[PDB]
Design a protein around this ligand. Sequence first.
Ligand SMILES: OC[C@H]1O[C@H](O[C@H]2[C@H](O)[C@@H](O)[C@@H](O)O[C@@H]2CO)[C@H](O)[C@@H](O)[C@@H]1O
Ligand SMILES: [Cs+]
Lengths: 232, 232, 121, 221
Amino acid sequence: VGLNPNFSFRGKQQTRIETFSDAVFALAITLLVLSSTIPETFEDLWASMRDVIPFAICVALIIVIWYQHYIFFLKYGLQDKVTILLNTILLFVLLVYVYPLKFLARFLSEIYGGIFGIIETDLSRFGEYSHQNLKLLMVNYGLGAFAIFLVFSLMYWRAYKMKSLLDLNSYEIFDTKSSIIANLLMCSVPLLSLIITLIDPWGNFRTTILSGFLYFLYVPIMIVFGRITSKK
Amino acid sequence: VGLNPNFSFRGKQQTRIETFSDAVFALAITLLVLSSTIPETFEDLWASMRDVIPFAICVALIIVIWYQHYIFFLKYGLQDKVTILLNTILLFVLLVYVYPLKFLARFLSEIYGGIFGIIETDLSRFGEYSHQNLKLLMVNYGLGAFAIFLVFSLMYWRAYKMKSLLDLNSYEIFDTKSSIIANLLMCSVPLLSLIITLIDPWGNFRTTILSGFLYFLYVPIMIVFGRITSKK
Amino acid sequence: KLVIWINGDKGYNGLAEVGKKFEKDTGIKVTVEHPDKLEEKFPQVAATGDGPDIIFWAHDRFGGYAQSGLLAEITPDKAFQDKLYPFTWDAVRYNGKLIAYPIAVEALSLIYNKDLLPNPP
Amino acid sequence: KTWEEIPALDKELKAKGKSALMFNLQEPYFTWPLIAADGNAGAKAGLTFLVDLIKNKHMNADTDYSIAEAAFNKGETAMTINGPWAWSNIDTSKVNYGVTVLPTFKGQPSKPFVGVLSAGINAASPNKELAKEFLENYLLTDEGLEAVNKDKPLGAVALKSYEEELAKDPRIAATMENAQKGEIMPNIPQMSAFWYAVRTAVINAASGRQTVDEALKDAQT
Ligand SMILES: OC[C@H]1O[C@H](O[C@H]2[C@H](O)[C@@H](O)[C@@H](O)O[C@@H]2CO)[C@H](O)[C@@H](O)[C@@H]1O
Ligand SMILES: [Cs+]
């Protein structure tokens, strides 16, 4: 059940903001899938089964936003104007990137579909894959990712700001303090790719490659950022 | 209320994963129905009333996924990364097969509509009913069914894996142990039809007939599989 | 006097409460002792001296006491003989003679702290 | 979170018939965190603000421990400044209290003095070897520190085994938060003459006798 035994989960009771959020989360992974058109013929039936992978990919993403949220509300169980205000924003962002992700995960599933040699379907459906559109892709999705993590960082900061009011013991502080740093290390990679793209050094695909290569190197770059703060 | 009096229901309190799931379930049986187009004229009104049966059929299916889920969460009331991870998957699958079912239950309701002699509407709407499309049908739906049951089997295995932590008494074990076997006997028929189709012995409709005939013989084939494990 | 010998790790206090109810219905005092190394102090003291009226220990040492001849042959009536399980009586039998009454089945278990270790090895 | 916003909070609380902060001003132990917040200049700034709190009639002139404790424990003041020992008396009162970081001042936080409660044996005593046994085997133990802490809390005990129960306490966190911001007192023999100089300097400034610039002048010599 619990991540930490030394932490006292305050929001064990389900609240309106938890109950509300859940509904707004369910509709993300539900309408992402079911926003699709009803297979009317076998031809459409086998077409809609090509889409399972894009949603599998996306929904996995969306449950991780829910799971990092479930844990925060379980932990502090806050229900104030600031938490509300941030929560609103966390979801607002999820929602605005719900179908854009559906598209990216469709787009990436066709790119990866040709590399493994499963399918050879055209990508002229997605439009002209130019530098600017591929840069906008990196800056667009990278922003949503920076944003979702930045909000979790700020929501955990709200908990640290009200540490004395929540009655956070010495062990509970280090979790909050670390969960800020953890969400901020997480929001540093999407900020970096977004920044590298926006500056545009090479003025060609070399820019988009690097920016994409930072999401593969998430764990090793998380350790590089973390080792610089411990070494001083 | 309860299936077993000797079982101590731990998840009697409604949790975020129960509350969340419910929302994702409601949207299955709600959007399956209401994904339809608004009857604008009497002609469309009587058309949409032909669809009551396909959804009646499907929704009955979807409440049984919910009811086998309601019971599991009521029983153990788990809320860990593995249960979450599996739950996600259980629903992911329900959702990806929500409209495909709508189609199958429309397709089957027109096949059955002609046998009883209620309607004689054309099936050229659904497309070319060839061997390959009818085989893909069996492998497609059979997979979703194997998958949904396989997840329940794995979720009940998570409970048995944490039997000592949940404090499962001698009576509670035999329920978990049996509920794995029960979901696995249930996931053995859709695996068998799926396997028979994929191998394709007769190379003609004789393959699709057998595979379809195993869902009629669900209870007798459940007893055949069960008697072999008791006889040894 | 009805003196009983049972290990100190068991429930000698709780056994004495049965003994306190026995003296009420008859009048025989029931003292319960828990000596150290009673598995090896029983065959030496009971043979020469008096020892305990009845002895409680796992059934494995009881074959050693029957061969030496330090245990009376048990003769339990069928009405009681049926109240317990059948296989339990087989663990307290030596050369076709009942040498003890089986109480309970024990076995080592892994005791773990759920606060310090939620998923143990 | 800052000392400069307490006068505003007092105006808001005085409208409802309540005080903002009452603490023992008579002892310089309690005025020191504010005085030594910035630092001399830091003390001039630190003390000048304290004088203004009494000058604006936000704090009482002869605020002692008894009335400061009773006021917060009754529910007449929303705050008070005290150590671990005072919590047990608040627990007796039906008050939903919290222990937090001291308010900051001029950006830098308040630097309180960190007392290390200690136990020493007297030179002119025939029971030297009898008291040693008590401090080690009976008092500074798992059990011995419990009996004292449950009566009136000590703070962060010196015993290593109590680290678990100390960390679990949310008040020890607030106390230890203020200790890492503050510094430990030097044991030197001049502390008596120092503390006396600070005790008088605060009382003369609080009553309305000596100026803030004239206080540090007299307190330096
Ligand atoms: O006030 C000056 C006084 O401060 C310190 O005394 C504290 C002591 O640390 C605590 O145990 C508590 O009881 O309050 C005292 C302040 O009232 C110094 O220890 C002492 O030397 C100094 O004079
Ligand atoms: Cs729609």
